[PDB]
Design a protein around this ligand. Structure first.
Ligand SMILES: O=P(O)(O)C(O)(Cn1ccnc1)P(=O)(O)O
Ligand SMILES: O=P(O)(O)C(O)(Cn1ccnc1)P(=O)(O)O
Ligand SMILES: [Mg+2]
Ligand SMILES: [Mg+2]
Ligand SMILES: [Mg+2]
Ligand SMILES: [Mg+2]
Ligand SMILES: [Mg+2]
Ligand SMILES: [Mg+2]
Lengths: 343, 343
């Protein structure tokens, strides 16, 4: 709604982002081809998603900053930082698709799977990250929140990288170990690898831009947002298997990749002894026959129904938390985001 | 000499770097295994090189800061930022070895070639980068140069990433094109991919720590340092082929990887028509027979003698530049570094 009404405006601003990124260096004609590759990397990897994270920066900014202080420059900075969150996303996704050996993303072939690209995508990803800070310097260098934003983007990256490390350590290829797939480990993984950058980061950025830098306020917002992020990742694990790749834009790999997904953890909590052996024998392997076996067992344990139930209970819990912690911020801030990821 | 007398002190400080990096998070026991992977990544990829870049921060700091202002905290920050440059190095090298399909580094198997690691090394690299800014926040958060250092490390990364992009664009696998291997393109590649982070960055960091933030002074230092960096990369290209892997610690891949190396550019400038065809037929291929062919032609054109001559002429030019641009900085600053990479 508020996201939907802002989407088009947000996207149209992408041309300027690209222009300022592919101009401030073109005064150095020697790197021209590199700059041209950068544009290509940006168009392919920053466009095509839902932009919920970037839009959140924009929406939250408008709801937190008094309209008398929302000048043209002020708004420009807001959707610029919104695009910075979108680039952090792109950066992690490009690397993540390589490390998960994924095939498609956002309804097109993964960048690293594009003939001509391959492992060069590693450097491409690093460039996407560098661009965040180019844009911050360009548009916010003079703002009082400049250092707060820089540290917030860096901190959020470290956290999601710590989370990725957990994600990958818990999922050795060729090493089946159902034993390590617990609730505790799962909660810790998703907290770091998704919850900070996808939910805390955008709202926290808008808070700093609105002059809201108070520690307690940020902690209170974080309380709500991390819990939403946990829900979001669990929903992401569900879609990996039970979602239509025509709508998700991506092919699942979690079972093949031996991941500590929410599905397998829930499967293990409901698994009879015989079922456990079926899981242990077919999990984390590339064979389509064995993956199908795992899915069949998930469906035999009504995990699809268990997810529908979790989603409702979780949503109610998020709402409760918003009632508790939203103040003094507008509740619409969190309600708007929550509405966007519900089901 | 001054580098040598400082080496041991510098290295011994690595234990503390690791401790502070693997402690400030251990208050979060949930990420403990990730933190343990981080320690493992740090020990394997930050140790074993010459530490010329880190040592430069330390040496330059001592020569630029008045001894009355070199308190214990002040020195601690200096070798900490020195280790930050070393981590930037590690970060790029881990990714670079993957993208160049290299086998060894610093006399051991490349991290990504270690059984158990593979492409997870992409995230490991990203962690090494994140650590730079953790350490900066930890030890320099209160210093007046804090934001200058942060932007200097970010800018230097963007530049070396732009350079890597040039390095990789000019070297498509399976796509031989001697035509693109020119002097101009070479100078532009090495300027961005090596010269900034390996030579300007360390000295510039010590300058900001010594309160020397003046634009003209930094530009003047940059004039000297980029030219040294060009020399250093050219020396690196020479060693890739004509160096002993027992001393370099790495196996060459430039010819196989179809790289715009200094050797091939010099070969092309001296290549008779028939020799050109030999180059075009055997360059950028994995076959050991064809690589040997390229090397034979390099030796037929006395490129080893041409490098020895370039090194002398270049060294004299660097010295000239130091005479011109060193002031008001101690010349020992640049002489010390130059002495360290001579031959
Ligand atoms: O399931 P993953 O965590 O790999 C994923 O959600 C990406 N990701 C990576 C960190 N956080 C999220 P994706 O399903 O989009 O491949
Ligand atoms: O020759 P490269 O530039 O790949 C190298 O010098 C690494 N590097 C990467 C950027 N700058 C330098 P290395 O020979 O150590 O593999
Ligand atoms: Mg993935
Ligand atoms: Mg992943
Ligand atoms: Mg997923
Ligand atoms: Mg290399
Ligand atoms: Mg390289
Ligand atoms: Mg080399």
């Amino acid at each position: 709604d508020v996201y939907a009404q802002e989407k088009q405006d947000f996207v149209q601003h992408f041309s300027q982002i690209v222009r300022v990124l592919t101009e401030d260096e073109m005064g150095h004609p020697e790197i021209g081809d590199a700059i041209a590759r950068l544009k290509e990397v940006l168009e392919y990897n920053a466009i095509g998603g839902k932009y919920n994270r970037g839009l959140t920066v924009v929406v939250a900014f408008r709801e937190l900053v008094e309209p008398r202080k929302q000048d043209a420059d002020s708004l420009q900075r807001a959707w610029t930082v919104g695009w910075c969150v979108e680039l952090l996303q792109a950066f992690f996704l490009v690397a993540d698709d390589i490390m998960d050996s994924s095939l498609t993303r956002r309804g097109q072939i993964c960048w690293y799977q594009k003939p001509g690209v391959g492992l060069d995508a590693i450097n491409d990803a690093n460039l996407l990250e560098a661009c965040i800070y180019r844009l911050l310097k360009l548009y916010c260098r003079e703002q009082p929140y400049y250092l707060n934003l820089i540290e917030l983007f860096l901190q959020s990256s470290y956290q999601t990288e710590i989370g990725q490390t957990l994600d990958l350590l818990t999922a050795p290829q060729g090493n089946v170990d159902l034993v390590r797939f617990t609730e505790k480990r799962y909660k810790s993984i998703v907290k770091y690898k998704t919850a900070f950058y996808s939910f805390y980061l955008p709202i926290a950025a808008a808070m700093y831009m609105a002059g809201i830098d108070g520690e307690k306020e940020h902690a209170n917002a974080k309380k709500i947002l991390l819990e939403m992020g946990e829900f979001f990742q669990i929903q992401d694990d569900y879609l990996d298997l039970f979602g239509d790749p025509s709508v998700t834009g991506k092919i699942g790999t979690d079972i093949q990749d031996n991941k500590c997904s929410w599905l397998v953890v829930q499967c293990l909590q409901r698994a009879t002894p015989e079922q456990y052996q079926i899981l242990k024998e077919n999990y984390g392997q590339k064979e389509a026959e064995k993956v199908a076996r795992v899915k069949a067992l998930y469906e035999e344990l009504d995990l699809p129904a268990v997810f529908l139930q979790y989603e409702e209970d979780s949503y109610s819990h998020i709402m409760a938390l918003i009632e508790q912690y939203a103040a003094p911020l507008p509740p619409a801030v969190f309600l708007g985001l929550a509405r966007k990821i519900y089901k």
